Each structure stands twice: as C-alpha cells, then as structure tokens.
C-alpha cells in the first residue's frame with residue numbers, strides 16, 4: 194500500500210487501484226517542417242485519443258535542443274488541450290523539460306535519470322512535477338547487474354533529492370534495453386522485485402524491445418505476446434506503471450493480473 | 457528440476473526445458489453421424505495439424521458412454537496416425553479411457569480426478585499411461601479453498617496410487633472454473649504455488665474461461681489477453697503445462713516467461 198497518491202497538478206493517479214498504463218505516443222515527424230505543422234500534430238492528437246480510449250492512464254511524448262522544443266511543444270499544447278490525461282515528457286535535457294511542463298506536460302521521463310543533465314532535477318524540483326529516473330550508463334562493466342543497477346539508480350535519487358525533489362515525486366525504472374545485453378535484460382526481468390527495497394514506485398518499459406526479439410526470434414511488429422509476458426511478470430514483481438505501445442492489449446493483461454494478484 | 461521425464465510410450469516430454477503446451481482440439485460434431493464421418497474427423501486432423509505447427513506439445517481430445525467411444529475413437533485413430541504428438545484423452549469414464557488408449561491416446565485427462573469412476577485409475581495403471589488428476593467436487597462448501605483443494609487433490613492421488621499408478625505417471629491440476637466461484641478461481645490463481653508441495657507436475661487450464669470474462673467484462677472470443685495473463689502467472693507460480701485454445705499466442709508467452717524465469 195502506497196500511503197500517498199501521484200500528484201500531477203490537474204490530475205491525480207492512485208497507485209493502489211491498478212497498474213497504471215503509460216501509452217507511447219508515436220510521432221511520425223513531418224519531413225518538411227521543423228515542428229508544429231498540421232499533419233504531425235493532428236496524428237499525435239488522434240493517436241493520443243485512441244490510447245485514451247484503449248485504457249491509457251498517461252501519454253508519453255517525445256523521442257537537437259533548439260528543435261527538440263519546436264517538435265515537442267506544439268504536440269503537448271494540442272494533446273493536453275484535447276485529451277484529459279497526464280502527459281509525461283520524454284527528454285533528458287533540462288531546457289526541453291522546462292518548456293514542455295510550461296507547455297502543459299505533467300511528468301518528467303528521463304532516460305538518463307538526471308545524469309545527462311543534472312539541472313533537470315532542479316526543473317523537476319521547481320515545477321514540482323513527478324520525475325521518472327531510469328537506469329542507464331555508457332558501458333556494461335557490471336560487476337553485479339542488480340547490485341550495480343540499484344547502486345546506479347540510487348545515485349540518480351541522490352541528485353534528485355539534493356535538488357529539492359520530494360520522495361513522492363520520484364519514480365524509478367530499471368531501464369530495460371539500455372546498457373544491458375540480451376541476458377542482462379532477462380536477469381533484470383527475473384529480479385525486478387529487488388528495486389522495491391528503495392521505497393519508490395517502479396515503472397517498467399519493455400514494449401516490443403530487442404531482448405523479446407532475441408528470445409522469440411521475431412521482428413518488432415511480432416512482439417505483442419512477448420511484451421505481454423514481460424508486463425505480467427513486471428506486475429507480479431510489484432511494478433506500478435508499464436510503458437507500452439499496445440494500450441488495448443496490455444490494459445487487459447494488466448487488469449487481469451491486477452485481479453489475480455489482488456491490486 | 458524434475459529428476460525424470462514424462463514417458464508417453466512413443467513420445468517423451470521433458471519438464472525442465474519449457475512449459476509444455478496442451479492444445480485444446482475443438483470438435484464441431486457432425487449433427488448427422490454418431491461419429492467417424494469424414495467432415496468431423498477431417499476438421500479434427502486439420503485442426504490438430506494447425507496446433508502442431510503453432511507450437512503445441514500435446515493434443516487434448518474429447519468433450520453418452522456407448523457413443524462417447526464412437527465419437528472419440530475415430531478422432532484419435534486419425535490424429536495419432538497423422539500428427540506426431542502425444543494425445544491426451546478428455547474423459548472421466550473408465551471404458552472410454554481404455555478404448556482411447558487402445559485407439560492410440562497417450563495421456564488420461566480426468567476432470568474428476570478418479571472420483572467419478574475410480575476404475576479409470578486402474579486403466580491408467582494397466583496401460584501405464586500418465587493420468588492428469590483435476591480438482592473437482594459437487595459443491596463449494598469450502599472451509600478453506602486452498603487447504604481443501606490440496607486435501608481433495610490428495611484424495612485423488614490416494615485412489616490413483618492404490619490402483620498401481622506410479623508417482624511419475626501423476627499430474628495435478630487445480631481445476632479452474634470447476635466447483636469454484638469467480639473469486640475462488642482468482643484465489644486459486646493467486647495461490648497456485650501451494651500445489652507444488654505435493655511433489656507432482658502441475659497443469660493449468662484457464663483458456664477463455666468465465667472468471668476471465670468476469671474480471672474483464674468480455675465475451676469468450678475476447679479473452680486472449682486475459683488467458684495470457686493467467687498463463688504467465690501460472691508459469692511464474694511453477695506449473696509445467698498449460699491447456700489452451702490459442703496455441704500460437706500462448707506458445708510465445710510461455711516461451712518468453714520460460715526465458716525470464718530461467719526454465
């Protein structure tokens with residue numbers, strides 16, 4: 194039982210009711226504009242709407258600098274305006290983070306857990322938004338995957354907390370498919386429960402990734418069942434959100450898991 | 457680690473390699489014959505073949521008396537002849553069991569765990585085939601679901617062993633959707649691991665069932681994700697086979713689970 198709720202300004206997310214579903218917003222960028230043009234933003238809104246209907250709880254948006262903003266800001270403007278859901282912003286850059294939250298984004302999603310740009314934690318602290326700290330590194334000289342993962346994630350927490358970030362605005366993420374061989378990803382999957390000793394909600398993103406292809410020997414568009422299995426173990430191992438492409442399918446697996454495990 | 461293999465005469469099933477997939481053979485019966493006619497047997501063979509291609513390890517066949525045989529015997533004859541896989545026979549009747557094994561079936565699948573016709577365990581003992589003892593009762597006056605389930609299953613084991621059945625020819629099954637309310641099924645799902653103390657391989661059959669519909673509020677043809685989730689937890693909780701309709705989909709989830717848990 195989490196003794197608090199995830200506060201997202203306008204929106205609130207309860208962590209005891211269900212596994213929360215983060216939908217990956219896919220942005221096929223107009224090869225012709227810098228950003229903001231009708232086709233890409235319309236497609237993003239449309240797609241945000243579909244995922245809202247498929248049972249999504251968060252819309253994840255993003256995926257240099259000067260024009261990271263120009264691409265991402267108009268999408269957040271349009272989506273928050275048109276879809277009643279918390280939007281997480283997918284960046285490791287401090288300036289982008291500010292602009293996006295200023296544009297209407299509610300959560301930070303940092304694939305570098307404040308190590309790329311430590312300044313981001315201050316933006317997170319300033320606007321008081323929840324920040325997702327994901328495990329990542331430039332190397333895989335793991336002495337001991339899980340011990341190092343937990344050590345690394347903790348170094349992220351230090352940076353966040355030292356910048357003013359409240360414990361209740363911290364979410365952790367094992368960072369599957371990042372700085373981890375196919376076997377290390379499996380090992381992380383198998384030991385997810387260990388991240389719980391840190392005392393923070395955990396998000397898992399395994400949607401359609403390489404290690405699934407590695408196991409099943411199947412291309413990206415053929416990874417739904419593989420993804421499902423990772424989401425189920427993830428829920429069984431105690432994670433609070435899952436970051437997925439297939440919102441309809443994963444929502445139903447999430448919900449069935451929830452019922453069975455008693456969430 | 458199981459220190460033995462599942463011996464099915466012509467075929468052998470290793471229990472340490474993977475979760476074994478039992479495909480439910482669906483028999484749309486010719487409304488016109490008693491059994492044996494071309495359309496129903498052709499459809500069964502065809503369907504057996506499809507599941508063999510989708511990654512199935514066992515074909516489950518069956519689903520009065522005098523004509524249980526007439527329906528089921530010609531199907532086993534044709535399928536064993538045409539598909540190189542162990543066939544389980546789905547009956548609680550002693551006479552049917554004999555005929556089916558005589559017709560080429562390898563495993564007994566008893567939804568009454570030898571309580572309907574105790575004589576079946578002797579057939580099982582005689583032909584030396586593996587028998588699946590499923591949990592079942594006529595009532596749900598459970599004092600304590602899991603304690604009673606284990607007690608009941610044990611009463612099945614007694615009957616089997618007393619009739620000559622070797623420990624290594626015994627498989628257990630929690631019997632989801634039988635003599636259990638929607639909540640009791642969930643409770644069984646949540647406590648599957650407890651069946652392991654009995655020391656026998658466990659098979660789980662949850663494919664497309666009511667309790668999935670109950671949770672997700674969805675019709676039978678819409679229960680793939682729900683089924684998937686039950687199969688994943690089942691594998692996580694240590695079961696050895698799953699009995700499913702959707703062989704292609706469940707095979708892939710099974711295989712991804714296997715990789716992650718380290719089977």
Ligand SMILES: CN1CC(C(=O)O)=Nc2c1nc(N)[nH]c2=O
Pocket residue numbers: 283302303304325327366368369370396397398399402436
């Ligand atoms: C922004 N991305 C991207 C990502 C990927 O591209 O695989 N995975 C993840 C991610 N964010 C989070 N929080 N977790 C992921 O696994």
Ligand SMILES: CN1CC(C(=O)O)=Nc2c1nc(N)[nH]c2=O
Pocket residue numbers: 546565566567588590629631632633659660661662665699
């Ligand atoms: C023959 N049937 C039928 C069945 C069902 O109709 O739900 N479930 C099961 C079954 N056999 C086994 N071993 N397990 C089941 O759950």
